[PDB]
Design a protein around this nucleic acid. Structure first.
Ligand SMILES: O=c1ccn([C@H]2C[C@H](O)[C@@H](COP(=O)(O)NP(=O)(O)OP(=O)(O)O)O2)c(=O)[nH]1
Ligand SMILES: [Mg+2]
Length: 903
DNA sequence: TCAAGTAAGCAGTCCGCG
DNA sequence: GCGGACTGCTTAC
């Protein structure tokens, strides 16, 4: 096999690399790497190295990396550009792995761990590490074993050994219900004291040194706690054994309103799963506790236990350890589903960066572009300092608030990357400028043609057409990967609907799920076999199809995020290729494209309908248009359709055979108008939406920009067994909206779109009557909480104090002096409830840490004083009033009337 | 919330609006 | 009480 790196670091004048050799073995080496950098030189000087603008460069080879860094400094002193890759380890990787890396994940040691620390005086701060570590569970991917380190003797209590027998039993049997599939994979090690525990953990770490290190909050808690605890007990040299190169650094991470410390372990790649999740999941969660996320992702129940965690070890050490084990397994289960580790490895090895650099789109693209240019003996420019400047973005059309019965949407394929490719936007392809007219003039095709030589954007930029720029070339490669995975995702989605249909008529039999590849549309043979399967087998197949879809989603959406990130990086001052000319060339072209095609679609439909000056495009945002299809349906007459699926087929055919060819013609003309390099504006049908045939449903509505709902029957070729609500921006979609309120508002919307006004009125009446019975957590609002201190004046709200912050201050006064009460954490999220006048808390609201039950110290009083009236008005009625007013209907029945008497 | 971008909505404070 | 100037937070894209 070809070799591949595991980790790389620069330590002084040495590169330290861990790698897998040609025989599949892990090895480590220290290389006295001599870096090269470049300076411009005279033409009369024969060279093979040229900068991206074709200017000749001389290569300077340095005796060592320190000399190279010093030369860069002196070049700044002189006032001359120092060209080349200044991050020497990336240059090292480029030289050492000068080929497309094929990695073998089975050879990479991925460690997943979690620790427990009993603390009787509040949250145990990792920077102090003053309490014993009393449990560590460490899963190793190569061994496929959970290694459990259990402290039996501590100043906070001496306990008996954990029992694997009781751990396996059902909770109804008094057990901990540790999943049976991992019971045989646990290796349990009890310790008589903490020094022995930690010395053994370090010896173990030396034998099985993680390459990828993950877990939940490991970067902010577990890692620094272990490091600092060992440092406190044994000293610095021992703690540094956590690094394979015995090198660590305290890293200060700054944010707008403060900073925190982490520990960098040279030679390890830490990928904290909470951060992988936040980056790759495309969720915004009301809480990021492992229990909350596990429930959301896996539908597992939260780990139950009596009393506070600070007393759990002494009261129930059995459960304490079992829950530490389960915590590690939960992260493994989330990854089995989401596959974020796989994704990180793919991206990291593709770019040739430290794996943890996947968190930085700028570092990722810097490396991809550097490797691409290096292959042509080209030399990258030096990064420069730029002042931050705002610049313009996408166009969003103002919709007329209203119901919209039949709607068809269209959207451009990966817009910004396609614009980069079409126009040929790149640092080195800038050809010049042209005198710009008002955007309106280009949209209406009355401005004079920008250029008859170069490819243009309506921001005034021109680009070469003789050769692709490095940005277009490299963005295309990642786009093509994204396209492949999106294909698998959609097939799995379509396959899912096939199974859902079959689940309506399952066979009464005992059988097994079919062995199929869900990434490809089911063949006729498979479909025939599916109709003869039991419900048990069908549901298992559905689960597998959905997991396949999720894997496809992870792979496709995050590759799209990467290429969108390149477009955005052009507008970030820290990017080597930062250039507002290029950033704005993309966004401005996007604004034109959207409004150009709005005009073309309107013109086309006015022609087909024999109307004039009517607006068929009701809305658009960035790269999508929404088209009213009422008139199209009406030309046939709703009476001629057999069922809902019949008119859906009709619209699907109309979009593909009539509208899309017209759309293509429009964009081809725009391409010629801008003299672009390649036509890549590909816009096809996305959604088909409308009410169920014969119903009083309204189909859809808009309240304003970025706020709408549609009853969708077909989404990009996936025909749904049951209609699916597409709701964007509305309160149902916001993590700040109470859980039970999201549910209720969604049902109100469903009834509006599918059933009509009377159905909505019936549901509203019921919810209003019963909502006071809802669990307090399900009706609490949620908010991030920043700058708590700023608004704290003697424990009371200062001027302009935000409502959620006021709630936190109320909470803080209520638990004052209690060292065991949960503390609100600056920057994290809280639940918020309004309080009735005259309450003992002394203010109109209270807030506590999100994802948790409010402390028993005050719970009863909070429950007693909750202001249900205010809660309902703010979170439910106000938003519903917005939906219904926009849709021109009433959630409460109006005077009959027509009572007229009895009945 | 360390880590590519902009557009734009709603809640809430403060306070004018004769 | 509504709504502009402002902050804070959250979406869509
Ligand atoms: O996080 C984002 C999202 C979108 N955008 C821009 C770029 C993107 O091309 C455009 C449209 O975004 P979408 O992801 O909604 N769709 P896109 O057209 O990029 O891909 P596709 O439609 O093929 O899924 O908005 C960003 O810059 N950052
Ligand atoms: Mg698109």
């Amino acid at each position: 096999m070809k070799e591949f790196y595991l980790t790389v670091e620069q330590i002084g004048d040495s590169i330290f690399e861990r790698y897998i050799d040609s025989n599949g073995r892990e090895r480590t080496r220290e290389v006295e790497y001599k870096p090269s950098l470049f300076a411009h030189c005279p033409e009369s000087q024969a060279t093979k190295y040229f900068d991206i603008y074709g200017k000749p460069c001389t290569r300077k080879l340095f005796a060592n990396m320190r000399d190279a860094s010093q030369w860069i400094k002196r070049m700044e002193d002189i006032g001359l550009e120092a060209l080349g890759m200044d991050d020497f380890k990336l240059a090292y990787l480029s030289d050492t792995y000068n080929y497309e890396i094929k990695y073998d994940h089975t050879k990479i040691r991925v460690a997943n761990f979690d620790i427990e620390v009993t603390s009787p005086d509040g949250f145990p701060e990792p920077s102090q590490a003053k309490h014993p570590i009393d449990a560590i569970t460490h899963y190793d991917s190569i061994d496929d074993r959970f290694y459990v380190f259990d402290l039996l003797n501590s100043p906070y209590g001496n306990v008996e050994e954990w029992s694997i027998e009781i751990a396996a039993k059902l909770q109804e049997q008094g057990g901990d219900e540790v999943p049976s599939e991992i019971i045989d994979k646990i290796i349990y090690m009890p310790f008589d004291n903490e020094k022995e525990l930690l010395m053994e953990y370090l010896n173990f770490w030396q034998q099985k040194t993680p390459v990828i290190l993950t877990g939940w909050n490991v970067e902010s808690f577990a890692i620094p706690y272990v490091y600092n605890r060992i440092k406190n007990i044994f000293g610095e040299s021992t703690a540094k054994r956590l690094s394979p190169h015995r090198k660590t650094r305290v890293k200060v991470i700054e944010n707008m309103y403060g900073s925190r410390e982490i520990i960098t372990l040279f030679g390890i790649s830490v990928l904290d799963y909470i951060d992988l999740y936040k980056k790759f999941s495309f969720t915004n969660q009301p809480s990021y506790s492992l229990d909350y996320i596990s429930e959301f992702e896996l539908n597992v129940g939260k780990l139950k236990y009596d009393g506070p965690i600070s007393k759990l070890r002494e009261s129930n050490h059995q459960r304490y350890i079992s829950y530490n084990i389960i915590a590690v397994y939960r992260v493994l289960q989330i990854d089995a589903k989401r596959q974020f580790i796989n994704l990180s490895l793919d991206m990291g090895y593709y770019a040739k960066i430290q794996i943890q650099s996947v968190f930085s789109p700028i570092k990722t693209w810097d490396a991809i572009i550097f490797n691409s240019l290096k292959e042509q003996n080209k030399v990258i420019p030096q990064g420069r300092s730029h002042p931050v400047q705002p610049y313009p973005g996408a166009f969003v059309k103002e919709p007329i608030p209203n119901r919209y019965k039949y709607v068809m949407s269209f959207d451009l394929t990966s817009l910004y990357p396609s614009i980069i490719r079409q126009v040929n936007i790149s640092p080195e392809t800038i050809a010049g400028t042209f005198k710009v007219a008002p955007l309106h003039d280009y949209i209406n095709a009355v401005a004079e043609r920008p250029s008859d030589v170069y490819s243009c954007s309506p921001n005034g930029m021109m680009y070469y057409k003789d050769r692709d720029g490095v940005v277009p070339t490299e963005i295309t490669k990642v786009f093509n990967q994204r396209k492949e995975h999106k294909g698998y995702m959609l097939a799995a989605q379509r396959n899912g609907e096939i199974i859902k249909e079959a689940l309506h008529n399952p066979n009464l039999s005992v059988d097994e799920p079919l062995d199929v590849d869900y990434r490809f549309d089911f063949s006729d043979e498979i479909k025939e076999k599916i109709k003869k399967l039991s419900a048990k087998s069908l549901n298992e197949m559905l689960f597998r199809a959905q997991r396949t879809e999720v894997a496809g989603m992870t792979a496709q959406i995050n590759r799209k995020a990467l290429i969108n990130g390149l477009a955005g990086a052009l507008g970030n001052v820290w990017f080597r290729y930062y250039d507002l000319r290029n950033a704005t060339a993309i966004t401005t072209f996007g604004q034109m494209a959207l409004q150009w095609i709005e005009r073309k679609v309107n013109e086309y439909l006015n022609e087909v309908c024999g109307t004039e000056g009517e607006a068929f495009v009701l809305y658009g945002d960035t790269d999508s248009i929404y088209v009213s299809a009422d008139k199209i349906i009406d030309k046939v007459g709703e009476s001629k359709f057999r069922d809902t699926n019949h008119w859906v087929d009709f619209l699907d055919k109309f979009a593909r055979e009539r509208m899309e060819p017209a759309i293509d013609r429009g964009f081809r003309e725009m391409c010629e108008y801008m003299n672009n390099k390649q036509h890549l504006m590909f816009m096809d049908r996305e959604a088909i939406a409308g009410p169920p045939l014969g119903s009083k449903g309204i189909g859809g509505f808009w309240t304003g920009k970025k706020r709408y709902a549609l009853n969708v029957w077909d989404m990009e070729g996936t025909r749904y067994a049951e209609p699916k609500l597409k709701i964007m921006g509305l309160e149902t979609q916001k993590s700040s909206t109470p859980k039970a309120v999201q549910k209720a508002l969604k049902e109100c919307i469903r009834r509006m779109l599918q059933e009509g006004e009377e159905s909505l009125q019936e549901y509203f009446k019921e919810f209003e009557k019963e909502f006071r019975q809802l669990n307090y957590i399900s009706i609490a609002s949620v908010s991030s909480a920043n700058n708590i201190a700023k608004y704290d004046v003697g424990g009371f709200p200062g001027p302009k104090c935000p409502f959620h912050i006021r709630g936190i201050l109320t909470y803080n006064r209520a638990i004052k002096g209690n060292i065991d009460a949960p503390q609100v954490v600056e920057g994290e999220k809280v639940y918020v409830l309004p309080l009735r006048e005259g309450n003992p808390f002394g203010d109109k609201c209270i807030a506590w840490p999100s994802g948790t039950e409010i402390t028993d110290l005050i719970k009863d009083d909070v429950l007693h004083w909750m202001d249900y009236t205010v809660l309902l008005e703010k979170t439910f009625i106000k938003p519903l009033e917005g939906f219904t007013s926009a849709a021109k209907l009433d959630y409460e029945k109006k005077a009959s009337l027509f009572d007229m008497f009895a009945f």
